Amino acid sequence: IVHPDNRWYKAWTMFILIWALYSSFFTPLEFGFFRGLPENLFILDIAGQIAFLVDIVLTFFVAYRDSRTYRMIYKRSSIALRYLKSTFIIDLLACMPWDIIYKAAGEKEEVRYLLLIRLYRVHRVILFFHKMEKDIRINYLFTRIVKLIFVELYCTHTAACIFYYLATTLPASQEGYTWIGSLKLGDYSYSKFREIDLWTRYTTSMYFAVVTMATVGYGDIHAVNMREMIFAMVYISFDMILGAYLIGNMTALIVKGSKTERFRDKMADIMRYMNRNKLGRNIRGQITGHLRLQYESSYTEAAVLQDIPVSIRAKIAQTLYLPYIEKVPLFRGCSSEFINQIVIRLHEEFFLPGEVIMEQGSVVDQLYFVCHGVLEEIGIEEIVAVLQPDHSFGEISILCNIPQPYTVRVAELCRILRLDKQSFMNILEIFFHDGRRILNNLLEGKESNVRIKQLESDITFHISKQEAELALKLNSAAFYGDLYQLKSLIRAGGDPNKTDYDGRSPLHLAASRGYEDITLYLIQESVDVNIKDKLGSTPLLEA
């Protein structure tokens, strides 16, 4: 049985985290303040190793994610082989009992030195902060302070236990040279230096380490020996590098600030300028409200949604904008994949009621789609046109290259879908079969449009040259008399009522070879039986 990330396993990991916290803080106490272990704490030493021992056997039955293929290996031999080459060499050594061995092997201090190997298992706590650091729901300033404080409070605790150990190396004959054997705070002699207590001995040693950690230095407790000066310089020099790291780390996070703090500064600057001239009473509220909407709606332009692959980005586009575009009156009859292409480039935009989108006489360079609210058109100030939801506007201006002649202002909270004009012909040019349909929709919609259009545009000229190019293949296909490709060609929007450059028509070429089999298809296709080319050659004469 293998449980990669089972809910029961996660509870066990937190349980062993408590033991890692306890054994990492208790090892310096046993190493420094004790010579051996008293019988009162025998049960604690045994229970501590057994809890970690189970983790040694239970870690062979846990799956891991492959670093190269992300496949969740699950192989029995792969889990074991990974662990024996990574941590099992050192982890097993820590679980070995050393209080018993040191007692059993006479009384030698050399073996007890290696008891410090248990300090590694503080790495579990550090990893816990690393996992919690990546969580979004947890404030980043909070976790960085906690991790830095713990990584500094632990070093102080370790330095305190070591400091008392240095005072125990000297024999009891010359205990007056030690930093604590000569201590006299008030009327406490501190003469014995031993069998005083565990708590009164520890709290005075830790009080020294904390005082020197914060660079206070009262001077009541201080290094007196020669081996204590050398350690004092090392701890003090190392502390100031770590001590300045806490200041530097918190300074960066405060300097960074947040989006609201930067947004507050921007409104503060403009308010001072606006109040400098003492201008406006209702204008002040209007501009302030517009800026509030700018920050509130500052999420459509998501720079994060740019590294996402297009296949994923395409799916999220059709789930929001597609139900609001497929039923636009201008886009009636177009093919499915053409709409799927314009929906990708659509942009969101919010407008506060009362403001103007574009003015009279200004050349329109953007196409706007109405998605919410209501829009009012004003001209002269008289209102004659109202833009309801799901109705586009400004399309005629772009196609006819005419500036907007009747300005529009918004009246209610309206969501406008913006399409760039520059990115509108290029998609239109590559899709010319349905490009005619949107032009016929525009003409059939309005009573007269704008003088039934005027052409003389790159969009209108290129769609004619592309469609005429298509009919060239259709003209050639009819010459060879291959009816198989004729039906398929006209199925995909192919129009038999098309003329090539030199006046020729498929009906004209049908009689060229006397292909009566395809001639009746053209009649069923409703072709002009008397269409004349540039040379005035009717199809009947050609036959």
Annotated binding site for a nucleoside 3',5'-cyclic phosphate: 330-445
**Residue placing its CB nearer to a copy of itself in the complex, 107 or 355:** 355
| Structure tokens given for 67 | 């670093």
Is the Cβ of residue 11 or residue 136 nearer to a copy of itself in the bound state? 136
List the interface residues with a copy of itself, window 233-252 (CB under 8 A).
233, 236-237, 239-241, 243-252
Q: How far is the CB of 524 from a copy of itself (least distance, A)?
A: 14
Residue 308 engages a copy of itself in binding (rule: CB under 8 A): yes
Binding of a copy of itself at residue 210 (CB under 8 A)?
yes
Task: Report how far apart, in Å, the C-alpha atoms of 217 and of each of 55, 209, 222, 334, 439 are.
Answer: 44, 10, 9, 82, 86
Which residue among 149, 322, 541, 543 contacts a copy of itself (CB under 8 A)? 149
CA 291/CA 276 separation, integer angstroms: 19
- 319-348 positions binding a copy of itself, by CB under 8 A: 319-320, 336-337, 340-341
Bridge partner list, 370: 416
Site for a copy of itself in 429-458 (CB under 8 A): 430, 448-451, 457-458
Question: What separation in angstroms does the CA of 188 have from each of 127, 198, 200, 201, 241?
Answer: 44, 16, 11, 12, 36
Query: Please, which residue, 441 or 466, has the CB nearer to a copy of itself?
Result: 466
Site residue total, a copy of itself (CB under 8 A):
164
Asked if 461 interacts with a copy of itself (CB under 8 A), we say: yes
Quote the strand ranges of 36-124, DSSP E.
none
264 binds a copy of itself, rule: CB under 8 A: yes
Contact 245, 251 (CB under 8 A): no
**In angstroms, what is the minimal distance from the CB of 334 to a copy of itself?**
15
The three state secondary structure string of 474-543 is: HHHHHHHCCHHHHHHHHHCCCCCCCCCCCCCCHHHHHCCCCCHHHHHHHHHCCCCCCCCCCCCCCHHHHC
Contact 339, 379 (CB under 8 A): no
Binding site listing = 330-445
Q: How many residues does the chain have?
A: 543
Closest approach, Cβ 530 to a copy of itself, in A, equals 20
- Taking residues 465 to 504 in sequence order and writing x for each that binds a copy of itself by CB under 8 A, - otherwise, the string is x--xx--xx-xxx-xxxxxxx--x---x-------xxx-x
Exactly one of 45, 55, 349, 390 binds a copy of itself (CB under 8 A); which one? 349
Among 21, 37, 73, 224, binds a copy of itself (CB under 8 A): 224
Q: Is 263 in the site for a copy of itself (CB under 8 A)?
A: yes
For a copy of itself, the binding residue among 299, 382, 384, 530 (CB under 8 A) is 299
Contacts of residue 55, defined as CB under 8 A and 6 or more positions apart, other chains included, come to 16
Tokens of 529: 């039986």
Residue 57 in 3-state DSSP? helix
Q: Is 5 in the site for a copy of itself (CB under 8 A)?
A: no
When asked if residue 409 is in the footprint of a copy of itself (CB under 8 A), the reply is: no
